[PDB]
Amino acid sequence: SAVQQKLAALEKSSGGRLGVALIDTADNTQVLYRGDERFPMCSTSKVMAAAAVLKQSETQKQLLNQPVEIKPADLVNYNPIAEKHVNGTMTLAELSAAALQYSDNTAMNKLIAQLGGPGGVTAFARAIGDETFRLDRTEPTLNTAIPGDPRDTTTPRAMAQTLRQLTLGHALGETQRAQLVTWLKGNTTGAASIRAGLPTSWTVGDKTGSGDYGTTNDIAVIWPQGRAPLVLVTYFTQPQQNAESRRDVLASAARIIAEG
Known part of the structure; x- marks a missing residue:
């Protein structure tokens, strides 16, 4: 198709490896480019950890207000919100917000701990029908993005379907889903x-991700004006361990899709 030819040309010009999945919720049609290849998730995995804690809050009604202590030893490499609360507390809602909207890595590690380790985040994916997602490590090593390494990867097709079910579908309760949508819409890292x-x-809610090998990712739910929403996943990685991020590639892939 025309879109797939333009995405292949974009990929060739970029020197990297691009994966795209679009779901149009108007007719449930899909557009895929390397849709079944694995890519390193990097911080896009934070959506799954936050959604898992949201699922727990359906039974534990007060869970999101539970205070969690931030100690100096908890801080890792990128903690823009957690740093402001060292030797104090943050609630699980505040940690989920920080993880999603500022990509705070300490916040992600607290969410993983709440779920019982990376195996608890993966379990949630399996419980909502995602057999592809795998989270193996904590922050910051889950971002190593080594070519061929299956750890901490998913495919574009799987992540698009799962993001659809979390935000537009009913994998979560109504209050929880609305909370997730509100968090995604307030992301600060995606401009x-x-x-x-x-x-x-168009209104967008998204979660970015970046890591080694120039890995540059973004997953989004999109609400066009007077038109059914779309879900769009864009993953990108490069052959050089020290390559620079390429957010422009994700922007260009979105523009090519939007032309459809």
Whole structure:
């Protein structure tokens, strides 16, 4: 198809490996490019950890208000919100927000601990029908993005379907889903990624991710004006261990999709 030819040309010009999945919820059609290849998730995995804690809060009604202590030993390499609360507490809601909207790595590690380790995040994926997602490590080593390594990977097709079920579907309770959507819509890190390739009147909720090998990712739910929502996953990685991030590739892939 025309879109797939343009995405292949974009990939060739970029020198990397691009994976795209679009679900159009108007007719449940899909557009895929390397849709079944594995890519390193990096921080896009934080959506799954936050959704898992949201699922626990359906039975533990007060869980999101539970205070969690932030100690100096908890801080890792990138903790823009947790740093502000060292030797104090943050609730699980505040940690989920920090993880999603600022990509805070300490916040992610607290969410993983709440779920009982990376195996608890993976379990949640399996419970909602995602047999592809795997989380193996904590922050910051889950971002090593080594070519061929299956740890901490998913495919574009699997992540698009799962993001659809979490945000537009009913994998979560109604209050929980609305909370997740509100968090995604308030992301602060996405201005130069998928959002940059889309009409400025469209509402987007997204989670970015970045890591070694120039890995540059973004997953988004998109609400066009007077038109059914879309789910769009864009993953990108490069052959050089020290390659620079390429958010422009994600923007360009979104623009090519939006032309459809």
